[PDB]
Design a protein around this ligand. Sequence first.
Ligand SMILES: CCN1CCN(CC(=O)Nc2ccc(S(=O)(=O)N(CC(N)=O)c3ccc(N(CC(N)=O)S(=O)(=O)c4ccc(OC)cc4)c4ccccc34)cc2)CC1
Length: 280
Amino acid sequence: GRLIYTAGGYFRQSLSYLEAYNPSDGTWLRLADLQVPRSGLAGCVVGGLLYAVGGRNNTDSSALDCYNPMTNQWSPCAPMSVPRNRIGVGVIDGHIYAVGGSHGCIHHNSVERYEPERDEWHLVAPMLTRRIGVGVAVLNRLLYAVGGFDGTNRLNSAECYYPERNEWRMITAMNTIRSGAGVCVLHNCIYAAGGYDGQDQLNSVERYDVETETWTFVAPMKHRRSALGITVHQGRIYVLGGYDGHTFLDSVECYDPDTDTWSEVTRMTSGRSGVGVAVT
Ligand SMILES: CCN1CCN(CC(=O)Nc2ccc(S(=O)(=O)N(CC(N)=O)c3ccc(N(CC(N)=O)S(=O)(=O)c4ccc(OC)cc4)c4ccccc34)cc2)CC1
């Protein structure tokens, strides 16, 4: 079936593991290592290929790498215009948007679009706010950028990028300050799980309802975590690993909306934070 893929991460050092999880049977698979270990990166899928974007290696990375699940092989792509650690990523119409992130102490508000048909990156309109450790979600061909750190403030704001118009507009702020949160879209809402509010790692979780332009809380996860991996598979949310203030988790929790519950459904081969994640 489809698999949940987790690339890179951090446990004492930057990692190059690429493992895949099969929710239809609880199995883990070991795939080809990343050529350079990275954490703080994001994953996404376009046309069957997995992409590892940005992060920080063993200095901050502008790398974009493609993984073919059919050949079990990694291949370099065109690099981004700038290094982007703690990057968020979305896909619109087969094009990868790289949002925010950091290069040393520069906190990006810039955004660039990658086209796989050309192996080219191009800058689009910059966000209204600099954000590293920013969650990114794509709903209704709109790209949403949620939380993060702007270099001075941890943020609870969120903005919205309009591709046809090439512009950003703020939207309603979350109830909670969140950097390094997990953000995805499940059943036409934006979900923001976990994060770091400035003093603690969070386990709260709020979804945004576009119509009501409201953020409302939902059942919190069992393990407070930041810098977690997140994805959606067969109508549920999966959060993977992360840091809870003391430990690098190996926990994988699964949110079911209909029942509004978080189950623990497996554990990673080892505990880690700062993984990129995708499903294909
Ligand atoms: C310098 C002194 N010191 C401090 C800590 N320490 C132990 C340690 O370092 N743990 C540790 C914890 C995570 C990693 S990581 O996942 O790999 N990584 C760096 C990467 N790119 O690899 C990242 C760090 C911080 C982030 N956040 C946003 C943001 N802008 O900071 S955050 O989640 O909100 C946060 C977490 C923790 C926190 O402290 C509680 C505050 C905010 C990230 C967000 C998204 C993706 C990666 C992030 C690596 C080591 C050793 C030494």
